[PDB]
Ligand binder design. Structure first.
Ligand SMILES: *[C@@H]1O[C@H](CO)[C@@H](O[C@@H]2O[C@H](CO)[C@@H](O[C@@H]3O[C@H](CO)[C@@H](O)[C@H](O)[C@@H]3O)[C@H](O)[C@H]2NC(C)=O)[C@H](O)[C@H]1NC(C)=O
Ligand SMILES: *[C@@H]1O[C@H](CO)[C@@H](O[C@@H]2O[C@H](CO)[C@@H](O[C@@H]3O[C@H](CO)[C@@H](O)[C@H](O)[C@@H]3O)[C@H](O)[C@H]2NC(C)=O)[C@H](O)[C@H]1NC(C)=O
Ligand SMILES: *[C@@H]1O[C@H](CO)[C@@H](O[C@@H]2O[C@H](CO)[C@@H](O)[C@H](O)[C@H]2NC(C)=O)[C@H](O)[C@H]1NC(C)=O
Ligand SMILES: *[C@@H]1O[C@H](CO)[C@@H](O[C@@H]2O[C@H](CO)[C@@H](O)[C@H](O)[C@H]2NC(C)=O)[C@H](O)[C@H]1NC(C)=O
Ligand SMILES: *[C@@H]1O[C@H](CO)[C@@H](O[C@@H]2O[C@H](CO)[C@@H](O)[C@H](O)[C@H]2NC(C)=O)[C@H](O)[C@H]1NC(C)=O
Ligand SMILES: *[C@@H]1O[C@H](CO)[C@@H](O[C@@H]2O[C@H](CO)[C@@H](O)[C@H](O)[C@H]2NC(C)=O)[C@H](O)[C@H]1NC(C)=O
Ligand SMILES: *[C@@H]1O[C@H](CO)[C@@H](O[C@@H]2O[C@H](CO)[C@@H](O)[C@H](O)[C@H]2NC(C)=O)[C@H](O)[C@H]1NC(C)=O
Ligand SMILES: *[C@@H]1O[C@H](CO)[C@@H](O)[C@H](O)[C@H]1NC(C)=O
Ligand SMILES: *[C@@H]1O[C@H](CO)[C@@H](O)[C@H](O)[C@H]1NC(C)=O
Ligand SMILES: *[C@@H]1O[C@H](CO)[C@@H](O)[C@H](O)[C@H]1NC(C)=O
Ligand SMILES: *[C@@H]1O[C@H](CO)[C@@H](O)[C@H](O)[C@H]1NC(C)=O
Lengths: 404, 68, 184
């Protein structure tokens, strides 16, 4: 009978930090012995650089594909009125020069030498522009803007459309429209408080960042080991020992560092495959639950999914799933059919419900009494083969109005 | 890439510096990815910021429906 | 290509290196070569396993699209091509599949005015499947796409409560069928 609206958060990471590793300078710092001895192993480190450039280009393609799914950007109107729906901490604030909503501002504040750390192709400014454009497109164009040219639909009637698509009649929206708006504002405030309160809610992004940093740190730590040789220093053996006599030691050092680099690259590579799969799943999530409304249940948050808000995040995306949570249950008696005048009757879309002896019809997920008429029923068969049928009359429309 | 270009037409970017092309203030479709919102194309070679399509804000009001 | 490299040994040859070198050091050379070639084979098969896993995941997605886009119609948005999906025509390809996507892209947009509901004779009006739409002083009903005006009747609309709390509601007369056929 009475329903409430809550909002949850889902964090799915998108793109790890791109790393580029050169072979020769990592093996040794500016020494000709590595130049004349590394080629004796063939073109081994060439395929390592090929694989890392492949990781860089697939990460760039992945972070381009996960967000850029609209041909045109959308800008919000300067009037902030949306029929009672207050979007202030969701809509980006022009007061800050970086054009960020406070929610991803708090999420950014909460979430924290021969190597090379390549910057991402898309920095946070264009990601914020992507999220603002997608939010504008999903607030002012309804659920139909990715199929072609842009349209405009006001908020309450596309709320009615989403309620019709979720399985209830659209008339119940306007009965408690201000209640739904107040519950939405309370849910946004509560999820902002939950984001500002829980420190372990963003554990996936911190986990993958810590994994990458720990892998690089262990790589750097194991680089400075002797690997069973005389000296751990990269270039001290060039002058301490005769270059005829240093061949076995330098060969052991280069093959140990090659094994360490190989196992680091395979670990990183496997992870890269995992993060590519996770970001592909997140891209399907965005393409299903933002570009239009979906009917499949328990896919975007807990409960019946109406629509979702995508927002910016470092190395990931965060969602705001708006759901339908029914409550205020009440016991009632039902019947599968009703037999009137020797003929069986069936509900058009609902179910026969009676508190006591007076029978009424109603929709699936909401309770409101309606008079049983002819237009919402049909006759098919007799009341002999069915079971559990009750006896009541059916009020016939157009019967008492055509007599005079 | 990465290294400051005080030591080594010259244009300073986030991911280092670019040598051989001139930076322009206009917008063009990205063809060659560079990084940190930089894209390059040859028409001479030039460099420009990332252009995210064209800006388009549809009209919104309290009562305005669009049906094709 | 990795077979032809000496891997830091004297030479890449196998039979000829046994003749010119004594077996006490030839076993060292063969040990170095066998370890390096085993490492190269391990790298190759690691690449083979990861490529097989990625191709298997992509092909499982392709099989899901095979069972979702081709078998019947899928209502889910932009999962089978761009826009709304109706049907798909797959063709045979070497080491892959190719997809066509018969889609529905409306165009030629025209501006219109609407109303959430209609108040008439102290009761509210709501469309059963259509939506209220108007151009001027006359009002009509239409579907979601391909605008088609129709006269408001009692079969495509229904009544739900009174007209007091609905915001933005406007007066409109309703043409009720069977009203002029009363005295015949
Ligand atoms: C189950 O719910 C139904 C729906 O409310 C209840 O039926 C209602 O019963 C009351 C009292 O019998 C009716 O009130 C009467 O209305 C007439 C209308 O002119 C008025 O003249 C009378 O003075 C009286 O106030 C009410 O109309 C009726 N509602 C409907 C839709 O028929 C029913 O009593 C409930 N049963 C139980 C066991 O709670
Ligand atoms: C909004 O669209 C409706 C639907 O087309 C327009 O109503 C129709 O307008 C036409 C042209 O004015 C009317 O045709 C005229 O009919 C009379 C006979 O009634 C005839 O003598 C004229 O020569 C002309 O053919 C048509 O009747 C009318 N439909 C109805 C049901 O009245 C309406 O004019 C449009 N409004 C605006 C502001 O564009
Ligand atoms: C459904 O639940 C909501 C949420 O509690 C109810 O709204 C409350 O209504 C009372 C009476 O006007 C107010 O004092 C409360 O402040 C409202 N709650 C909130 C959170 O604003 C609503 O009345 C319930 N409806 C039914 C039919 O039980
Ligand atoms: C939408 O909700 C926000 C969040 O409460 C409102 O922002 C508040 O505005 C008042 C007046 O400027 C401040 O005193 C509060 O501190 C703000 N709350 C914050 C920043 O959390 C905003 O006014 C609301 N907008 C509408 C139209 O109701
Ligand atoms: C609904 O009403 C019909 C007729 O008013 C009932 O049918 C009769 O039921 C009695 C006893 O239940 C039998 O003796 C008669 O022979 C039946 N007549 C016919 C024509 O079938 C029916 O049983 C009632 N159903 C319920 C659930 O009360
Ligand atoms: C519906 O009317 C609105 C008027 O508010 C149109 O919006 C403007 O249309 C003109 C002419 O096409 C443009 O030059 C403006 O840039 C538009 N403004 C905005 C904010 O979009 C709108 O284009 C009309 N729609 C249709 C389909 O005709
Ligand atoms: C049509 O709308 C008008 C105003 O928008 C309504 O007219 C008023 O109705 C109230 C009570 O119904 C009267 O007390 C006023 O005197 C009316 N004002 C005028 C200027 O007529 C009218 O009721 C609406 N029509 C219907 C059928 O509800
Ligand atoms: C419905 O009846 C069952 C059976 O006694 C009971 O356990 C349950 O609490 C009742 N629910 C309500 C809402 O009255
Ligand atoms: C490069 O060095 C100059 C010092 O002259 C400094 O002003 C500038 O910020 C440096 N740029 C980077 C990217 O480190
Ligand atoms: C145009 O580009 C130059 C590049 O150095 C920059 O200094 C200048 O501020 C830009 N002008 C505007 C209006 O953005
Ligand atoms: C929508 O209604 C509000 C409430 O009066 C008003 O402030 C706003 O200007 C209206 N917007 C329009 C007519 O575009």
């Amino acid at each position: 009978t009475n329903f409430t609206i809550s909002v949850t958060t889902e964090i799915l990471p998108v793109s790890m930090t791109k790393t580029s590793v050169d072979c020769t300078m990592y093996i040794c710092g500016d020494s000709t012995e590595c130049s004349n001895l590394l080629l004796q192993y063939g073109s081994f480190c060439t395929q390592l650089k090929r694989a890392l450039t492949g990781i860089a280009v697939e990460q760039d393609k992945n972070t381009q594909e996960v967000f850029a799914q609209v041909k045109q950007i959308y800008k919000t109107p300067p009037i902030k009125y949306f029929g009672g729906f207050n979007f202030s901490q969701i809509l980006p604030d022009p007061s800050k020069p970086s054009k960020r909503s406070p929610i991803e501002d708090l999420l950014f504040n909460k979430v924290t030498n021969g190597l090379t750390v390549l910057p991402p192709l898309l920095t946070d400014e264009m990601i914020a522009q992507y999220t603002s454009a997608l939010l504008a497109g999903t607030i002012t164009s309804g659920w139909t803007f990715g199929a072609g040219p842009a349209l405009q639909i006001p908020f309450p009637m596309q709320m009615a459309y989403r309620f019709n698509g979720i399985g209830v009649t659209q008339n119940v929206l306007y009965e408690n429209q201000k209640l739904i708006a107040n519950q939405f504002n309370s849910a946004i405030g509560k999820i902002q408080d939950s984001l500002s309160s829980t420190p372990s809610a963003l554990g996936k992004l911190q986990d993958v960042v810590n994994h990458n940093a720990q892998a690089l740190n262990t790589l750097v730590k194991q680089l400075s080991s002797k690997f069973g040789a005389i000296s751990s220093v990269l270039n001290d053996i060039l002058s301490r020992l005769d270059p005829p006599e240093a061949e076995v030691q330098i060969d052991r050092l280069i093959t140990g560092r090659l094994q360490s680099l190989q196992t680091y690259v395979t670990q990183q590579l496997i992870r890269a495959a995992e993060i590519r799969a996770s970001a592909n799943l997140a891209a399907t999530k965005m393409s299903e639950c933002v570009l239009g409304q979906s009917k499949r249940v328990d896919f975007c948050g807990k409960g019946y999914h109406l629509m979702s808000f995508p927002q910016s995040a470092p190395h990931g995306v965060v969602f705001l799933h708006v759901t339908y949570v029914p409550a205020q249950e009440k016991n009632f008696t039902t019947a599968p059919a009703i037999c009137h005048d020797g003929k069986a009757h069936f509900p058009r879309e609902g179910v026969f419900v009676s508190n006591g002896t007076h029978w009424f019809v109603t929709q699936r997920n909401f309770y409101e009494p309606q008079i049983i008429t002819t237009d919402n029923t049909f006759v098919s068969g007799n009341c002999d083969v069915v079971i559990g049928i009750v006896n009541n009359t059916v009020y016939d429309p157009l019967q008492p109005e055509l007599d005079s | 890439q990465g290294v400051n270009c005080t030591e080594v037409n010259v244009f300073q970017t986030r991911a280092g510096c670019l040598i051989g092309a001139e930076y322009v203030n206009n917008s063009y479709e990205c063809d060659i990815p560079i990084g940190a919102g930089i894209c390059a194309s040859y028409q001479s070679i030039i460099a420009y910021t990332m252009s995210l399509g064209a800006e388009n804000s549809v009209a919104y009001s309290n009562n305005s429906i669009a049906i094709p």
